[PDB]
Amino acid sequence: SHMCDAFVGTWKLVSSENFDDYMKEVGVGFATRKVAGMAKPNMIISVNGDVITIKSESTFKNTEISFILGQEFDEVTADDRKVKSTITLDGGVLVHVQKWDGKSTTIKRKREDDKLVVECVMKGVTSTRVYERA
Ligand SMILES: Cc1nc2ccc(Cl)cc2c(-c2ccccc2)c1C(=O)O
């Protein structure tokens, strides 16, 4: 079906802006913010039929989620939140909403030129993380 063809691949983080404030807003403690903020993850995105898998490999944590668009799932985040996640495709953007403890954060993943841009939003705080092909 070629859904998400442009996202598929191996991507390496090259820049991050305002991620400390994002993590604070989400509730991440001091030490975890410091160590997570250093990391330069490899994000590996693959598709097999209707199932999308996004793996993140880094010095901090390795994470993996597999999901079907529109179908809620359980996720344990890198900072150990136990969240309920739903990922949809809206106008070519992967939109990932995480719900936990009456809170919500949204992570958007977009293809821009040869980059994959990740925008993380919690209340009024945004962080932008830019990935290039690995
Ligand atoms: C989207 C996201 N949200 C987070 C929230 C809190 C903390 Cl501490 C970490 C993350 C991370 C992350 C950062 C560094 C290495 C590995 C994961 C990511 C991610 O880039 O995949």
From Swiss-Prot:
Intervals of motif Nuclear localization signal: 24-34
Domain of life, source organism: Eukaryota
Record remark: domains: Forms a beta-barrel structure that accommodates hydrophobic ligands in its interior.
Residues carrying N-acetylcysteine: C4
Protein name: Fatty acid-binding protein, adipocyte
Modified residues (Phosphotyrosine): Y22
S-S bonds: none
Subcellular location per the Swiss-Prot or TrEMBL entry: Cytoplasm; Nucleus
UniProt key word Transport: yes
UniProt-listed PANTHER family: FATTY ACID BINDING PROTEIN (PTHR11955)
Summary of the function given for this chain in its UniProt record: Lipid transport protein in adipocytes. Binds both long chain fatty acids and retinoic acid. Delivers long-chain fatty acids and retinoic acid to their cognate receptors in the nucleus.
Subunit structure: Monomer. Homodimer. Interacts with PPARG.
Chain positions found as Phosphoserine: S15
GO cellular component, as recorded: cytoplasm; cytosol; extracellular exosome; lipid droplet; nucleus
Gene: FABP4
Main location: cytoplasm
Lineage: Eukaryota, Metazoa, Chordata, Craniata, Vertebrata
Organism this protein belongs to: Homo sapiens (Human)
Keywords: Acetylation, Cytoplasm, Lipid-binding, Nucleus, Phosphoprotein, Transport
Entry's Gene Ontology BP terms: brown fat cell differentiation; cellular response to lithium ion; cellular response to tumor necrosis factor; cholesterol homeostasis; fatty acid transport; long-chain fatty acid transport; negative regulation of DNA-templated transcription; positive regulation of cold-induced thermogenesis
Chain sites annotated for binding a fatty acid: R129, V130, Y131
Molecular-function GO term, any one: long-chain fatty acid transmembrane transporter activity
